């Protein structure tokens, strides 16, 4: 839904964060 | 192909918990969008609710305070649980994927791509 | 929340017929930065859940015959189907997946008229 305006960070899959 | 198919009671009883779980197969639980919807005659296609690849979870508002949805990456599941159910909620309840569009590092859903065959539930005494 | 309003809710033509399907929201599904329409076409025949056919408006899913098309802008869309054929009879519904919460209009049932 581009309108709400709380788009999730381009972390997808969220990856080890080693 | 992707396949999800959910699993449920049949019956719920006034006032109880309702849980459902999707099974996922060909698509990973860990990636996108999935989305809870319900269908009934009367009110036809309502979506519930989502949960993102972050673990955001996104709420109709007219159902937000009894819904939970989650994932369990170990089982490639979705879940959805609904508290404190009358006859309104029953219906035929479906998981969906939904994919996502990124336009520069961050991402939305647009589209409930995959549906499952859905599973019957009546809120009943 | 956004309303989505479908016409007519229910319509019938001969085999090989053209059939229009028309959606109406009442706030803009254009999204300016992606300069795409959030609009999603699907189709439910019984026992089966709704199946997609068309998405951003007009961008045909694989699999779905060449018969389906999608067009439109803003607030006002509309599904064609350019030769019925009798395996296309079902409900057809529209959804907007611009603004939680998402919402679905209430559905377009296609007949064939034999």
């Known amino acids: 839904q581009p309108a709400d305006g709380n788009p999730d960070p381009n972390a997808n899959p969220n990856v080890d964060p080693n | 192909k992707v396949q999800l198919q959910e699993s449920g009671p049949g019956q719920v009883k006034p006032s109880e918990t309702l849980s459902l779980t999707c099974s996922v197969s060909?698509?990973?639980?860990?990636?996108?969008?999935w989305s809870w919807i319900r269908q009934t005659p009367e009110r036809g296609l309502e979506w519930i609710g989502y949960i993102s690849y972050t673990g955001r979870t996104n709420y109709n508002p007219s159902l937000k305070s009894r819904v939970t949805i989650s994932t369990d990456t170990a089982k490639n599941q979705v879940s959805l649980k609904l508290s404190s159910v009358t006859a309104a909620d029953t219906a035929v309840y479906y998981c969906t994927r939904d994919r996502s569009e990124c336009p520069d590092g961050s991402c939305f859903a647009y589209v409930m791509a995959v549906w499952g065959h859905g599973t019957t539930v009546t809120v009943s005494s | 929340d956004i309303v989505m309003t479908q016409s007519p809710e229910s319509l019938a033509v001969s085999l090989g017929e053209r059939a229009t399907i028309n959606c109406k929201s009442n706030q803009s599904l254009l999204y300016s930065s992606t300069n795409k329409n959030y609009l999603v076409w699907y189709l439910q025949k019984p026992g089966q859940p709704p199946k997609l056919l068309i998405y951003w408006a007009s961008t045909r899913e694989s699999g779905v015959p060449d018969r389906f098309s999608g067009s439109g802008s803003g607030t006002d869309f509309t599904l064609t189907i350019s030769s019925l054929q009798a395996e296309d009879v079902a409900v057809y519904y529209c959804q907007q997946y611009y603004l939680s919460p998402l919402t679905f209009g209430g559905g377009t049932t296609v007949e064939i008229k034999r």
């Open positions: 060909g698509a990973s639980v860990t990636v996108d969008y």
